[PDB]
Amino acid sequence: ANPLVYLDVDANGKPLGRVVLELKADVVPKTAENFRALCTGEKGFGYKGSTFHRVIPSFMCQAGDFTNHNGTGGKSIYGSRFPDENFTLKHVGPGVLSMANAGPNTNGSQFFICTIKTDWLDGKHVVFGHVIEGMDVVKKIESFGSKSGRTSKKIVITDCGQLS
Ligand SMILES: NCCOCCNC(=O)[C@@H]1CCNC(=O)/C=C/C(=O)N2CCC[C@](Cc3ccccc3)(C2)C(=O)N[C@@H](Cc2ccco2)C(=O)NCc2ccccc2CC(=O)N1
């Protein structure tokens, strides 16, 4: 069955609640496994303690740069980067979980959660899951963003892992 993972998120130390994500291992197993392992921290690194560094209302909330905290860094469990697995799943609406990148075949650890349908990213970013619980928490994160993406509070993934 598809893995379920969680992000517990805070803003300036105040808990916002839990986001639960279903990872579509049935369609993108390699991309799902990378995210799952970065949630559990089992390789010795991952999302715990890192930030949503770029949050743009009516677009998406971006996170996963646990090395540089600014959209330039991150690393996968497969080495630094890994290729785009497929573009089967589309950016259909709020709650889509997809890989951030810097062009083709540059996936590492950065990811985003959409707050709208972002169809112009179809075929360019690998979609690999969806929010199943806690979209209200995603909307709280979104509320601390701005047009440039700079956040007005430090938004931290306080804890994360797999629900089994
Ligand atoms: N109309 C309503 C809504 O409208 C909104 C319209 N805006 C949209 O569509 C916008 C329009 C186009 N601007 C952008 O590409 C924004 C770029 C941006 O912020 N950099 C800041 C961080 C560094 C940069 C450049 C750099 C430097 C060093 C190393 C690698 C790269 C640039 C980057 O590129 N780092 C990746 C992250 C990443 C690196 C490695 C793995 O991951 C990044 O952030 N990629 C951008 C991105 C991330 C997640 C989802 C989508 C998108 C596309 C997007 O943001 N597209």
Author numbering: 3 to 166
Can you quote the paper on this entry?
Cyclophilin D (CypD) is unique as a mitochondrial cyclophilin and a key regulator of the mitochondrial permeability transition pore (mPTP), a transient channel on the inner mitochondrial membrane that opens under oxidative stress or high mitochondrial matrix calcium levels. A key structural feature shared among all cyclophilin isoforms is a shallow and highly conserved PPIase active site. Adjacent to the active site is the S2 pocket, a distinct exo-site that forms part of a long substrate-binding groove for peptides. In particular, three gatekeeper residues (positions 123, 124, and 145 in CypD) and one far S2 pocket residue (position 118 in CypD) are highly diverse among cyclophilins.
